[PDB]
Design a binder for this molecule. Structure first.
Ligand SMILES: Nc1ncnc2c1ncn2[C@@H]1O[C@H](COP(=O)(O)OP(=O)(O)O)[C@@H](O)[C@H]1O
Ligand SMILES: Nc1ncnc2c1ncn2[C@@H]1O[C@H](COP(=O)(O)OP(=O)(O)O)[C@@H](O)[C@H]1O
Ligand SMILES: Nc1ncnc2c1ncn2[C@@H]1O[C@H](COP(=O)(O)OP(=O)(O)O)[C@@H](O)[C@H]1O
Ligand SMILES: Nc1ncnc2c1ncn2[C@@H]1O[C@H](COP(=O)(O)OP(=O)(O)O)[C@@H](O)[C@H]1O
Ligand SMILES: Nc1ncnc2c1ncn2[C@@H]1O[C@H](COP(=O)(O)OP(=O)(O)O)[C@@H](O)[C@H]1O
Ligand SMILES: [Mg+2]
Ligand SMILES: [Mg+2]
Ligand SMILES: [Mg+2]
Ligand SMILES: [Mg+2]
Ligand SMILES: [Mg+2]
Lengths: 370, 370, 370, 370, 370
């Protein structure tokens, strides 16, 4: 009975192998009080994790331990994993194998510290780290495809042909949904709405998840928003204030396709996918063009698949059939692939056991998870 | 067996922790004779405290030692506390912990002198100072709410969310029931009734407590009072003279909502409550709008809760549910919260002992009562 | 050609706007015979007003219609105003606008009855009521100052800054020259001089106007009067009896600064002026300290300005320049300000006309004279 | 002959291009009377602007039309600009180009309404809006530097490298000198000094400008203030009262470096400057570390440059030379840069003319001022 | 007075025939601004070439016009040649013959467009294109040898025996120093150092030039780097950050000998040199084994000659004397050979004149430069 934990930058997904949906999906935030507790007998913890930190947002500073796929606070990461094991899944980690997720081209100390914390703090019997895009390909039943994975920390593009990784063609951008949340925070001040705190950042993230979309033609959509008022929508703040947003619904996701509005020199996701395809051998590009898979929460914008199809079809040769696979459950696709991968009988010999960690230290994670 | 003393500007409330009502409620006045005693063998003290000063009003000058929450006469304060301990409660203060009350944003010398007098003159074994609004929240069983406390000296608005104080949003006005008594004294001269002495000030305070109320619509109430005579009431003076009052029943409490009739530049209590709510984080305002708590004697005007609800609902967004909590026993609510707070076992480690005062002086009251 | 009538408690001042002195100054007394007329053919009226009542004092009971600024006998007030219009000024009131005076914080029925009597009994074309202290500020050419006005009925302290009234800081004491006359009547019985009748009250008023003064240091003056006989003066009664007075020359005006010798709980005039200054905003106090204006007959005591300056300089901060303005013509200053105010062209639109009274009744005096 | 107007939240600076100092520096306040004018013939306007509102503080409510860099009252803004053009500069705005200032990340309606009021109410021939920090860089002769601008409304940090703006790295805090004035008002009540009105707010602003400073080590300065009395200073109030202040001289500016004492979740000015430097490209950080420019009145605290240098040198790598440029005339630096920018011949083609406004409306300000 | 221009992918070398060193060596980059110029009067070109683009790296996107020896942007190539002629050499190209360089097995349109731009844009009187490896053999005084030339775009291996080219044995790999820079960028993310921009690519190129070397035994060097810390070195970034690198010093140049770590199917430089020798006739191999010449910047790694000697001696028969010629000035060797070749009197009849270009078009470059 293995445990599958998709530990992304923004949201933690956790559950059991063999299941089809994550049992526990909760934000990976740690909240700490900014003020002094004055009423006694209440019961006031010094730390709040997950949905409890989200429900007490107005008196807490919220911190993400993971930034751009890299854990920057390991004590808060340990707190989040403890909340995963003991409060959400309600299991003992000493009797369950654990499969973790990681973004490609991460520092090696991240993998080593994850292995050390899993084997020493939680005393797991078995452990493995997988790349998220490979799990996204696992969930779709495919062995050939190019995966665009965009969550909250980073966006990575990984091509796989016939079950073989092509690590020279793996591309990675530091743009994901948190940068889109910050950009929407910046461009909402043009209408007079000020958001600066971490709780207001969570409010703007809710605004982006509810009302933002990807325009098929950006300049035509700007002309339509300038002409009429059919684009503007209303959102109710937690204090009852109603705000109205116009072109910011599609200007903020446009940073995914044109990162220069963030001051970034990198290319957009369509150009990155095309460059990853062109970095591969000429005999695999046809299968990659027809098997473009998207996973993650940032691929859940309305109209992102049609725009991605249009831009890649513009980039590709005219005889190539470009197909974008954006299933309705793609936001959990990485986890679903983990739930497939930990459930295979061929995978059962690829676990890192406690004996191998005892004889080799954390560095065995560089020899068993490749 | 702790002692709870709500030492407000106008009235002193005193009793034991674990009780539900104050054992001794009496005016905090010191009376001194204006004339010379001519009959010998009577027994004539040079000072009268409390109800004895109130029963001998016609030959005494009455002085309040506390003005706007700040003690201005410490010898008379010592006399009132001596009358509390030895004549009203009839206890020895050397064997009972004492919990005192204070308004927020008071001078630090007030707290220091209260600690010094409690530990040196009365030799208490333990001591604590609390903010009155926090005790008002204690009495209602709430840990989240915004407290409007108005007694005789000052009106303070304190928001608390999830047991956490928000001291940047605490607001304080120097308008309370004594200023309303003085305003009623001023506007009763329009009908030909002259009140200038301190005993006449106590008579006008009795008139305000018996016959004044808060109008729902002030201009409509003025039109109704100008049209008919159904608003006018009669009051009997101590010498048997019967006076009749009309619009002064609702013109005097209207200074609570429009302080400009007192020559004050501050806002009314509804605007102050709204400004304190808007000074807080956006994620706590919903719980503050539905948990507006009033305590004190100035909140015992008839119709003040309906008017407060109407004005705050006018100020708040239309989707916000404004609830005013005005319980029938709110005039003693601060004391009741003290009787709860001194009765908690978790509070028993937060007393300032005699050893800490001996090793640190009065300044320990700035480190233990926050 | 407007008429200016300063109708004080003790003395009536009357004349024309544009003049510098009142045309007719006479006591506001009504005298009635105590005995039966026995000689026929003389011509014996049932009522004597003014100087005729003063010249026939020994067979009349003298009554003041105004007590402490409030008219208590309106028929005698009508008699005095008739004597003003037809015997003193010798005009027709139906063709002259009339400007009247009133003390602040008077009953509203006094103003209403004054308006009704002026418009109905005397049929004036225009009418206005002013506060006396504002006219005292008008006479000195000042727009900023604090006026201490003390005549025969009441003493009022009114601060004005930059032409703006500060009605929350207006203070009023029921001590003036009539109470000083009664106190001098009481303390002259210690030397064996009995005065009980109204004519003897007028004699004692003459004694106070001729021989009383304000001591700079009261205890030093009492020591000087106890040591030598240089303070004692002689006064000749109307029957030729010569009386001698000592410390009563300065003990009777000392009730202005210490009202407790009258059995009054109020403060003295220096403390009342200081309390009125401290009731104002902190940015106007500097101009009020240097512009203290005195008007009225009770401010005509010798040495009252030096004593007022000394006590206010003791009360004020040491960096404040206290200036007392006591001009030699201040006893008529209110009237002089009326003669200025009714002579201004900007004031000519502020009269209450007969049409406004016909359409609104007496209550228009609460809407036009504020 | 262009006009340069630095229209900040607290103070309005105005003059001519080519000059080195602003011709007219005056507070941007509008004062309205709280009371009724009682003396006629004075001349009493319903509105007072600037120094006339400051000289009549005790009878006025003072309002700032700009809060945190955003105009909240446009009629009072029009009054202040009318006072600038016709009473201070004494010019006709119809023949002079006008260059205005704005804080970055302001609402677009502020710029649009400024353009509409300048072109329609005042009928200017030409118009431009600049960012204040770019003008601060203009005044120092620099084309590369990071500007910390803190006045009365907001604090903004803007980096510029080789004449190129970096708008993704522009940071903005809502903390400036008005919040410091309010914090000093709050912490002066601990010593028993009460300030609540707008005139008292101006008095506390004068106290902060005269006696407050930035401590190099805050805890060492608190220990020094607790040990001896060499830190305490005396201030004379307008009514002559002398108050004494101790650690509040350096506790109030400490909110610039630790905003959590205001209940704010933002970082201090040193951390904000460091975060703006780290938001830029790695090849420009060396020039930004050595060219940190401060401008505005809130940077005129004694010891703020040494403390800023110490904290940034603590934050920066040890091989980096941190240089803080705090010239003695930096309080006018924005205006001086405007006087440079409007005097350049290359700038003369960048004005928004009346023809462009007539053909395009206010929205042309989003196409010409970037 | 001919001009010799070695126009490689990364660096442009330029000077005069008869000299021993290039007069001007500068990077062949064109920089364009990513942001908008905000400060006027500076002087801001839209394009920066060479060292000016390198000194303004943080606000520019840098582009190489030559990729793998082939010009991909001819306008930027024209800009670089204009900067060579007019800013670096400071000559007129209309009076100087120009000798250019090219890699073998290039497209014919590259040579044709180079001839057309030289004769039409710059109006040169004479022109020639040479292969770089033949010039490397010219610089060493040799007429027999096999040249391994590796710069920034491509690596080519050209054997020449007795002055005769052997074009069937010329080999070409698309691996050179730019691919090594990209590989070092990829493997520096394992230590947590992120480099993605073009300026960061130039920084990583500086890191590779300063700290990278070729290991004699790769597995022994990996064991030594894993055992101790004597291999790790420190580098200071332009912002003052100090980074530490370990095995990446020799892992990145190992792609020259094992291209499979780049995802390339080609052989290493030692195997390519051996395969080029074995493609020749059996009677010339002895002279080629003893005359292996290296030129270019990628041959300037420390230890590349010893490793090349070891691997070729392993590949060659044991009786063959393998000699690697790696002179200290080999990075400029191509240019030096050009400076020899354009200085020979026998070469003076082999120029392509303007008359031949006018009568034949660009295609004459396929008949005169073989
Ligand atoms: N419907 C939606 N539309 C747009 N963005 C979304 C939506 N739902 C979630 N997101 C964004 O996806 C991000 C996290 O998704 P996820 O892939 O679970 O992150 P991670 O894998 O990094 O935990 C968040 O930044 C969130 O704002
Ligand atoms: N029924 C009432 N209606 C209006 N005011 C009241 C009533 N009862 C008491 N008060 C006023 O409340 C004030 C004191 O109440 P309390 O809260 O006990 O004062 P404190 O807390 O300052 O001692 C007095 O000024 C009194 O006039
Ligand atoms: N020279 C004086 N010294 C002291 N008191 C005086 C003098 N002259 C008049 N008075 C007193 O002033 C009072 C009346 O003065 P006035 O101001 O005219 O009164 P009102 O304004 O009330 O008519 C009388 O009581 C009189 O005794
Ligand atoms: N010497 C000083 N020390 C500290 N603060 C000052 C000083 N002089 C002015 N200030 C503060 O600077 C603020 C306004 O300065 P300024 O930069 O002109 O404001 P703005 O640019 O917003 O008009 C005011 O809040 C004032 O209190
Ligand atoms: N000392 C060195 N060690 C390793 N590589 C170097 C060194 N010096 C230069 N290079 C590399 O050589 C390449 C360019 O050299 P060069 O032969 O001048 O190129 P090209 O001939 O293509 O212009 C660059 O990629 C640079 O990184
Ligand atoms: Mg993820
Ligand atoms: Mg109370
Ligand atoms: Mg009078
Ligand atoms: Mg400014
Ligand atoms: Mg080369």
């Amino acid at each position: 009975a293995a445990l599958v934990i998709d530990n992304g930058s923004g949201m933690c997904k956790a559950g059991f192998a063999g299941d089809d949906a994550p049992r526990a999906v909760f934000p990976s935030i740690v909240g700490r009080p900014r003020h002094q507790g004055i009423m006694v007998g209440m019961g006031q913890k010094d730390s709040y994790v997950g949905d409890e930190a989200q429900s007490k947002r107005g008196i807490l500073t919220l911190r993400y331990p993971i930034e751009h796929g890299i854990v920057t606070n390991w004590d808060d990461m340990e707190k989040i994993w403890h909340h995963t094991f003991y409060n959400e899944l309600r299991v003992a980690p000493e009797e369950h194998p654990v499969l973790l997720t990681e973004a490609p081209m991460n520092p090696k100390s991240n993998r080593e510290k994850m292995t050390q914390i899993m084997f020493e703090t939680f005393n797991v019997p078995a452990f493995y780290v997988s790349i998220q895009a490979v799990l996204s390909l696992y969930s779709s039943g495919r062995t050939t495809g190019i995966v665009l994975d965009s969550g909250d920390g980073v966006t990575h593009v990984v091509p796989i042909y016939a079950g073989f990784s092509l690590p020279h063609a793996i591309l990675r951008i530091d743009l994901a949904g948190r940068d889109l949340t910050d950009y929407l925070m910046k461009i909402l001040s043009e209408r007079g709405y000020s958001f600066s705190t971490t709780a207001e950042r969570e409010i703007v993230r809710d605004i982006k998840e509810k009302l933002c979309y990807v325009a098929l033609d950006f300049e035509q959509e700007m002309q339509t928003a300038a002409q009429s008022s059919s684009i503007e929508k209303s959102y109710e703040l937690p204090d009852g204030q109603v705000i109205t947003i116009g072109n910011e619904r599609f200007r903020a996701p446009e940073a995914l396709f044109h990162p220069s509005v963030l001051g970034l020199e990198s290319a957009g996701i369509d150009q990155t996918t095309y460059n990853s395809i062109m970095k591969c051998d000429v005999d695999v590009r046809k299968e990659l063009y027809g098997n473009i898979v998207m996973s993650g929460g940032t691929t859940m914008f309305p109209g992102i698949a049609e725009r991605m199809q249009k831009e890649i079809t513009a980039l590709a040769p005219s005889s190539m059939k470009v197909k974008i696979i954006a299933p309705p459950e793609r936001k959990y696709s990485v986890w679903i692939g983990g739930s497939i991968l930990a459930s295979l009988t061929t995978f059962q010999q690829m676990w890192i056991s406690k004996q191998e960690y005892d004889e080799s230290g954390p560095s065995i994670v560089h020899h068993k998870c490749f």
